[PDB]
């Protein structure tokens, strides 16, 4: 997997940037109902099936 195609690495980059908690100022908006990041992914729990 060290020798990887560009398609695999590009999707790996996208998953890396999405692995963050919810920004705090989102909860302070008017009529906000989002409490947490429901799509959080961790490498030890669910695989990407890429």
């Amino acid at each position: 997997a060290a020798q990887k195609s560009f398609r695999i690495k590009q999707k790996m980059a996208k998953a890396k940037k999405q692995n963050r908690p919810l920004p705090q100022w989102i909860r302070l908006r008017t009529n906000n109902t989002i409490r947490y990041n429901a799509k959080r992914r961790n490498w030890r729990r669910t695989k990407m099936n890429i």
């Binding site: 690495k9 590009q10 790996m12 980059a13 996208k14 890396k16 940037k17």
Partner: protein, 120 residues
């Protein structure tokens, strides 16, 4: 009589081929330069590790467009900053961006160019 044919194989004869002379243009407005100097060089990288190379190795670190190759990066650096480039090394970072290590020739100092740009 008849033409003398020394070969029993018949082949397609060669006929005149004309070049295109369109009645109207395909797009009528050429697109501008898709990768100019300001698009090849996006912004300098100013992490602590990158700053050491500027002071020590005479190397400037830049974030560049994913579509730019080493020829375009060298040409852009010379035109934007009026310097000379010895060689360029590039890599694709884990976040999907391209980083270029640009080493200047001995006639130029990477430190005084870096603060001329504004970053330190």
């Amino acid at each position: 009589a008849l033409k003398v044919r020394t070969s029993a194989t018949f082949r397609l004869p060669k006929t005149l081929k004309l070049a295109r002379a369109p009645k109207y243009a395909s797009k009528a407005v050429p697109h501008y330069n898709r990768l100019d100097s300001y698009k090849v060089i996006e912004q300098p990288i100013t992490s602590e590790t990158a700053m050491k190379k500027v002071e020590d190795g005479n190397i400037l670190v830049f974030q560049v467009s994913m579509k730019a190759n080493k020829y375009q990066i060298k040409k852009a650096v010379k035109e934007l900053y009026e310097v000379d480039v010895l060689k360029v090394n590039t890599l694709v970072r884990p976040n999907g961006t391209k980083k270029a290590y640009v080493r200047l020739t001995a006639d130029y100092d990477a430190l005084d160019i870096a603060n001329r740009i504004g970053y330190i």
